[PDB]
Amino acid sequence: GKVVSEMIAWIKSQKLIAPRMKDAPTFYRNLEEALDVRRSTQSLMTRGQSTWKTGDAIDFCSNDLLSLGLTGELRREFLAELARHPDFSLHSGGSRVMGGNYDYIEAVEQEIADFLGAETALMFNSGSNGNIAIYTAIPRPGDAIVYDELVHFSTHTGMAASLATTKVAFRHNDLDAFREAMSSTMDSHPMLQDGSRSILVSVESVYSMDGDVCPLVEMLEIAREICPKGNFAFIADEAHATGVVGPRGVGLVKLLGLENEVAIRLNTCGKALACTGSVVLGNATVRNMLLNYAGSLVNTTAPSFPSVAVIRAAYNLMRTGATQKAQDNIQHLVKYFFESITSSNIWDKATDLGILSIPVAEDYESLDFVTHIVPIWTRQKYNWWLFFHLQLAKIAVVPIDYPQVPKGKSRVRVMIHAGNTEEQVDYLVATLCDFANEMIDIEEGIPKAAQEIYALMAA
Amino acid sequence: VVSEMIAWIKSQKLIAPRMAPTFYRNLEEALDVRRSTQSLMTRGQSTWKTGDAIDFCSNDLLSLGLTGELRREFLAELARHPDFSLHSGGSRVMGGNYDYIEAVEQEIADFLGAETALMFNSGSNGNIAIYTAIPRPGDAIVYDELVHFSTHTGMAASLATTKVAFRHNDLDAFREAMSSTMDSHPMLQDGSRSILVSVESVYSMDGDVCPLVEMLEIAREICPKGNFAFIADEAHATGVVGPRGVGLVKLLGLENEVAIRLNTCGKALACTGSVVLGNATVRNMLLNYAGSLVNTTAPSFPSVAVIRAAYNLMRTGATQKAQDNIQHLVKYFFESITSSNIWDKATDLGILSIPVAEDYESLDFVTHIVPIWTRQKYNWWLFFHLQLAKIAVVPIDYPQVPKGKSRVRVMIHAGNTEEQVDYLVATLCDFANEMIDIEEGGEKGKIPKAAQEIYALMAAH
Ligand SMILES: C=C/C(=N\C=C1\C(COP(=O)(O)O)=CNC(C)=C1O)C(=O)O
Ligand SMILES: C=C/C(=N\C=C1\C(COP(=O)(O)O)=CNC(C)=C1O)C(=O)O
Numbered sequence: 001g002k003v004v005s006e007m008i009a010w011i012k013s014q015k016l017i018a019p020r021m022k023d024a025p026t027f028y029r030n031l032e033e034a035l036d037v038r039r040s041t042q043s044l045m046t047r048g049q050s051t052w053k054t055g056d057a058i059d060f061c062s063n064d065l066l067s068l069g070l071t072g073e074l075r076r077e078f079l080a081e082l083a084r085h086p087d088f089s090l091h092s093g094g095s096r097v098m099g100g101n102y103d104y105i106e107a108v109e110q111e112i113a114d115f116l117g118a119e120t121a122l123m124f125n126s127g128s129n130g131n132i133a134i135y136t137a138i139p140r141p142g143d144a145i146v147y148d149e150l151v152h153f154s155t156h157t158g159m160a161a162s163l164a165t166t167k168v169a170f171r172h173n174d175l176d177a178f179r180e181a182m183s184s185t186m187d188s189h190p191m192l193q194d195g196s197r198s199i200l201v202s203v204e205s206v207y208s209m210d211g212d213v214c215p216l217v218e219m220l221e222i223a224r225e226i227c228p229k230g231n232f233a234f235i236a237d238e239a240h241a242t243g244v245v246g247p248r249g250v251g252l253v254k255l256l257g258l259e260n261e262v263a264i265r266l267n268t269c270g271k272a273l274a275c276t277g278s279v280v281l282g283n284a285t286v287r288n289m290l291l292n293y294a295g296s297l298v299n300t301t302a303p304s305f306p307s308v309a310v311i312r313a314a315y316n317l318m319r320t321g322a323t324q325k326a327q328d329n330i331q332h333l334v335k336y337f338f339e340s341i342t343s344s345n346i347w348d349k350a351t352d353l354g355i356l357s358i359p360v361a362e363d364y365e366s367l368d369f370v371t372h373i374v375p376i377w378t379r380q381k382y383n384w385w386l387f388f389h390l391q392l393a394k395i396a397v398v399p400i401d402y403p404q405v406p407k408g409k410s411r412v413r414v415m416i417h418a419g420n421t422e423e424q425v426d427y428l429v430a431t432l433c434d435f436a437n438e439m440i441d442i443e444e445g446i447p448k449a450a451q452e453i454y455a456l457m458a459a
Numbered sequence: 460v461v462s463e464m465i466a467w468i469k470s471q472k473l474i475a476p477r478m479a480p481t482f483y484r485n486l487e488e489a490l491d492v493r494r495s496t497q498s499l500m501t502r503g504q505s506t507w508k509t510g511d512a513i514d515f516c517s518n519d520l521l522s523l524g525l526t527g528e529l530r531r532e533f534l535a536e537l538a539r540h541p542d543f544s545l546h547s548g549g550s551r552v553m554g555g556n557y558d559y560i561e562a563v564e565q566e567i568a569d570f571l572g573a574e575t576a577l578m579f580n581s582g583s584n585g586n587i588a589i590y591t592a593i594p595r596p597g598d599a600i601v602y603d604e605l606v607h608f609s610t611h612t613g614m615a616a617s618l619a620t621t622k623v624a625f626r627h628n629d630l631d632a633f634r635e636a637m638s639s640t641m642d643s644h645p646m647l648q649d650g651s652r653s654i655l656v657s658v659e660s661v662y663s664m665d666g667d668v669c670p671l672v673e674m675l676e677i678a679r680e681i682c683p684k685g686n687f688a689f690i691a692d693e694a695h696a697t698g699v700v701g702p703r704g705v706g707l708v709k710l711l712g713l714e715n716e717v718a719i720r721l722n723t724c725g726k727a728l729a730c731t732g733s734v735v736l737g738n739a740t741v742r743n744m745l746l747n748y749a750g751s752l753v754n755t756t757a758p759s760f761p762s763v764a765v766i767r768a769a770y771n772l773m774r775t776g777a778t779q780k781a782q783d784n785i786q787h788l789v790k791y792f793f794e795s796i797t798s799s800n801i802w803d804k805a806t807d808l809g810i811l812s813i814p815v816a817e818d819y820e821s822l823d824f825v826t827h828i829v830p831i832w833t834r835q836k837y838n839w840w841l842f843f844h845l846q847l848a849k850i851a852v853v854p855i856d857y858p859q860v861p862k863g864k865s866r867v868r869v870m871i872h873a874g875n876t877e878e879q880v881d882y883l884v885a886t887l888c889d890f891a892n893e894m895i896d897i898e899e900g901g902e903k904g905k906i907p908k909a910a911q912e913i914y915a916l917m918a919a920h
Binding site for chain 2: 025026027028030031032034035038044045046047048049050052053061062063064068069070072074075078079082087088089090091092093094095096097098099100101102125126127128129138140143152153154157160161195196197198229230231232233263268269270271274275276283285286288289291292293295296298299300301303304306307310398404
């Protein structure tokens, strides 16, 4: 219904356009050629995945992790906050370092810093812009940056525009690769050996595409061994930790008691906190560096009063414990899914033959917590078939494919939210087991859902 | 005013003497570079917000923030959507699209005469998306040297390997850049790649206006095959320029001649955000190739509702009186200052320079941006003089502008008054006479009175 119409519109958007542009102006011809590159791999994006918003599919795909958007709970606190300031000055006035600073945003920043165990907080209009500010303003000429290969797009962008001339990736979440990257970097830079410059380590506390967790404590001990003079600093992107991990949602750094061991933290508002924005946490030196050397921040308008107030409302709900039941339900639902799927009659065979692969589901019991992110893998030649199967079963997931990941690394990403139900998880597990069975049957002799999409294409 | 100045003074005191782990020591060393030129930024210029100084400083050009007019429409908009879904859901191309934001985009496009619109959280992000998604390999970009920081950043991250600046607002320089770029690229000569031209409608730190009609004629001359596209950054034009605030492009009837336009919400529209305007091909290019957009959360409902409210105020004519009042007040300032007894002498000697005030009468309209120059060695003294007179302005210095090109930026707002302009004119004339007097007295160590007070407070703390 809505699923089929969203899917027909998607199919039509992949039809090549350059053959109809032969007499158009050069400028538009060449843009439609560039769009045709993405169309030619059925990867052109247009209107996204929205069947869940109309209730026509289960939401196993959105970033509304605590369901604070879905329930209106954030909206009600946001409106309460605006009602406590009936004469509020909506407009900031300009740049945060020119006409745009004001008492309310500084007070809200300090509330958040205090709740999260940091000396200061600086507000941005997104997590992406916070990472841009960090890696353009913080690294010094002669510094080196050592980063997990799977840091966010905005970190890669920020590092590429950085003053630091040494940037080293290491294999994702691999402690031996981290040690080798640190060792090799320290040993090849005289200014790092003598301690006149620093190694900046960039990690995510929870990884957007894989759902695993940064071994922060272990990486800190390694950093101290390779850098006896202490000339290093960690930067932790907690986009997918805040609200989900730790008591009252303080995130992974505070949960591990590392708030004084991590120089820079980024906590964003676009996922569990159900709005937009972010704060960068650090001491006054870090904050003043951002205000003076992050060109991106200097040259943009400071947040309006409503944008600050909605962030305060999110933190209000967290700080007062109003989110703890939802945060706990994520844990329950995710483990509920792990137990159900790994207990299915087909789980062993499908994992053996490579038909299904859910790495976060392996050894989840040896974890102090699970995360809301469940990437699900099949054979690379089956990935669209898996998505089509879930889609036609009215389960909304996000397909992950080139250009978001390399060709041949495609998957689907299931997001488990606080407002999901055990019945929905039951339906997800059954639906997954159907797909696994259909493929096991085919290999021992096109799946039905793909047949259906391919029929729509032929139409 | 004094508390702001004291805090500013202390912030310039060198910290590295006390510095400490390597990481923090090197940071405060970098901060000390700014402190040593008394140019560290911290809390900005805010004395006007509490009424302790006149606002000749802020970007609240139509006074929609000051009057509460935007706030009231924004809250009425929210009340008309009592069950609104606050959270977008994710990225605009994944979980974060929804009907309300698509409808508000199209309403803004229709108001501005464009085919389609795409919403961003800022004008900066809009420019980042444009220059990272739109230029193709083999294209050239020809840009005014004074485009915005975000445009410089985006162009550096561009796939275009030819990028050519031209001298600010200079039609001869533009023609030279276009013709030399055409003359050296065979694929521009044969029409198979494009020249992208990047300008601002109204220039943030200079207040002059792009001669857009004249640039389009030159482009058509140099590119007879039509293989060019204009990109107009209208940050300082929406709300202030054109009938009902539609901006410069629409004022000139060039909606179909300028392929890409940026209209931002952080100035006259008194909030935050932007839209990029163009046809569906342009919009699809941003959605697919601007990684900054693909990898960020789509706007919340209130962020879209406050922008809708600002455009609804404009489209219902509720900003036209304020827009006309800016024009009156700026022209009133120009007539007053250029009528001052000391004007001719101060401008001849270079004690005062206000280029936008010369030949203002021959303009079809004026802008709110009034950059005021003195001698470079007096610019902080000028700011001190205004600040102590309880007049708030923004002091502009490197890195915002090149070394040796510092100035102060007055912004005129609909909410200002002729009496406030009178006091500004008088304060500027006092400053001019005092500095003329010092220069003629032959005592090279003599400090003006405002700067004396600042130096006294520095001596204390
Ligand atoms: C675009 C949504 C999204 N990813 C966003 C992240 C950001 C950007 O934050 P925002 O600009 O949206 O505020 C910074 N770091 C990390 C680790 C992220 O996952 C997702 O669907 O996972
Ligand atoms: C933020 C301060 C400000 N200038 C902002 C401009 C931007 C960025 O817009 P935002 O990111 O703030 O939305 C793009 N283009 C132009 C021409 C601008 O003047 C000013 O005080 O001049």
